[PDB]
Amino acid sequence: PAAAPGKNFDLSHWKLQLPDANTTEISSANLGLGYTSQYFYTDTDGAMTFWAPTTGGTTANSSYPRSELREMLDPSNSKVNWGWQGTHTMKLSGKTVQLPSSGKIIVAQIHGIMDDGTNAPPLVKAVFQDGQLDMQVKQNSDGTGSDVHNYFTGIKLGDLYNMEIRVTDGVAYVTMNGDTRSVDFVGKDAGWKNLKYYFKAGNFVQDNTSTGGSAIAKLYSLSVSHS
């Protein structure tokens, strides 16, 4: 009978994307009002808890299901997003409780988006496996090329991680447990200046197999700042 996550976290500038068959989205307002379900709930430890099955519905340009928050600078218009200039920082603490058969989920992101709201590549993906978090930074803004890996080894299932993802003036700074690495993405491809960005945090399950099971990820803190 614990309070729902929207009472414990500031979700006024997040919407929730779900792994039901119809990939339903829950508005910022409904999160604040106390939305909770099998996909999104407060656990006994107070954590904002994201559950998604590998059989879940998937968004138009992903093969994989998610129960994941999507940052909304304007909760009434998803086309309003931030740019490469200035400082944009997401901080979180959390843990991954259960993995699917693939042993891989994504627990935080910066996602690119076109000015018109059209999809663009992810910029940063925090990839969790039992024993390693890889904070991947995409090389090119058109999706060509590969990713710059940033491995933080020794992070296990159930361990508490403290994460920060920051963009300042076209450079990404990725931090786990006080260990920061940087990638100059605008310096790799000036095309990134032609995209906008939004944060994501939750449980984006890198397994779509019918027998893959499901994943659980938890957050104990989540904050975003733009300056």
Ligand X SMILES: O=C(O)[C@H]1O[C@@H](O[C@H]2[C@H](O)[C@H](O)[C@H](O[C@H]3[C@H](O)[C@H](O)[C@H](O)O[C@H]3C(=O)O)O[C@@H]2C(=O)O)[C@@H](O)[C@@H](O)[C@@H]1O
Interface contacts to ligand X, rule CB under 6 A = 17, 23, 59-62, 70, 78, 109, 111, 119, 122, 125, 204
Give the nearer residue to ligand X in terms of CB position, either 59 or 194. 59
Give the nearer residue to ligand X in terms of CB position, either 73 or 186. 73
Give the nearer residue to ligand X in terms of CB position, either 17 or 28. 17
Shortest distance, CB of residue 46 to ligand X, whole angstroms?
26
Compute the Cα dihedral for 211, 121, 173, 225 and give only its sign.
negative
Shortest distance, CB of residue 117 to ligand X, whole angstroms?
6
Shortest distance, CB of residue 1 to ligand X, whole angstroms?
31
Give the nearer residue to ligand X in terms of CB position, either 17 or 67. 17
The three-state secondary structure class of 67 is: strand
Give the nearer residue to ligand X in terms of CB position, either 48 or 113. 113
Shortest distance, CB of residue 44 to ligand X, whole angstroms?
29
Q: 74-79 long-range contacts, Cβ below 8 Å, gap at least 24? A: 75/12, 75/13, 75/15, 75/27, 75/28, 75/29, 78/15, 78/117, 79/115, 79/116, 79/117
Shortest distance, CB of residue 135 to ligand X, whole angstroms?
13
Q: b/e for 47-78, b at 16 or more Cβ within 10 A?
A: bbbbbbbbbbbebeeeebbbbbbbbbbebeeb
